[PDB]
Paper text:
The crystal used for data collection belonged to space group P21. One asymmetric unit consists of two molecules of the protein based on the calculated solvent content of 44.15%. The hDDX41 DEAD domain consists of an α/β fold, which is similar to those observed for other members of the DEAD-box proteins for which structures are available. The overall structure consists of ten α-helices (α1–α10) and a β-sheet formed by eight β-strands (β1–β8). In agreement with this prediction, results of the static light scattering analysis indicated that the DEAD domain exists as a monomer in solution. The structure of DDX41 DEAD domain solved by us contains motif Q, P-loop, motif II, motif Ia, motif Ib and motif III. There are many interactions between the different motifs, which probably stabilizes the overall structure. The P-loop presents in a half-open conformation. Although ADP or AMP was added in molar excess to the protein prep before crystallization, no electron density was observed for these ligands. The DEAD domain protein can bind ADP and AMP but not ATP in vitro because of the steric hindrance.
Numbering used by the authors: 157 to 398
Write the structure that this text describes.
């Protein structure tokens, strides 16, 4: 409980909450498969950022998390890499069937953030496959794609979905996607999402979970409004600030 604070102070990591898992200074010690480690080098990513150092082990242990981190902090790997791992184990335990809804869900304010994060997921998923792991399937639920097209992407079952709140809500209400097996919900740029009026749509999306989920909220800012929303959204979260 003693050296971990030295790690944190050095990399300017502020944490709140109980039973915080130890920070980890290397991707290998976070027990990632080598195909992912190679993907990281191959993208020039040799060393974990502060948000990754404390964030990844927090997520891996199943804790809810509030991440106060900015665009460019490396936050995207914090919420993409662990769920890919989670999905990989589920698919190995029981291969996903044709319509089995998403296991992991990532909600973004905008179409372009959604595509970009979806793009990242498909990169790591592809490297796993090229190591003989099964294909994990990543779906986009954003505006500008038809209904037909949306149902096409998920006909094979979907492990991970990246959505904007409006389109996802509509699909849930129309029973075209289900959250019956969704165990992981990441909220990216939550501050922006609140500023844009998506609060209600997101609370509605919440009501489509039957039973526990791990929830993650990422926000560049933590004013009183985001703080109250986070308290209602998450369960005993570890708060991590860089
Ligand atoms: Mg961002």
């Amino acid at each position: 409980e003693e050296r971990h604070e030295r790690v944190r102070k050095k990399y300017h990591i502020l944490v709140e909450g109980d039973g915080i898992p130890p920070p980890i200074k290397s991707f290998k010690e976070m027990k990632f498969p080598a195909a992912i480690l190679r993907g990281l080098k191959k993208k020039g990513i040799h060393h974990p950022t502060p948000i990754q150092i404390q964030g990844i082990p927090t997520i891996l242990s199943g804790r809810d998390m509030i991440g106060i981190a900015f665009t460019g902090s490396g936050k995207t790997l914090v919420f993409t890499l662990p769920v890919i791992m989670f999905c990989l184990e589920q698919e190995k335990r029981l291969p996903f069937s044709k319509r089995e809804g998403p296991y992991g869900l990532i909600i973004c304010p905008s179409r372009e953030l959604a595509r970009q994060t979806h793009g990242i997921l498909e990169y790591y998923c592809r490297l796993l496959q090229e190591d003989s792991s099964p294909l994990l399937r990543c779906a986009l639920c954003i505006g500008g794609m038809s209904v037909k097209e949306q149902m096409e992407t998920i006909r094979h079952g979907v492990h991970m979905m990246v959505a904007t709140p409006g389109r996802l809500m509509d699909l849930l209400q129309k029973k075209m996607v289900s959250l019956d097996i969704c165990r992981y919900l990441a909220l990216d740029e939550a501050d922006r999402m609140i500023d844009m009026g998506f609060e209600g749509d997101i609370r509605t999306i919440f009501s489509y979970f039957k039973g526990q989920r791990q929830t993650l909220l990422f926000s560049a800012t933590m004013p009183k409004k985001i703080q109250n929303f986070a308290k209602s959204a998450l369960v005993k979260p570890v708060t991590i600030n860089v």
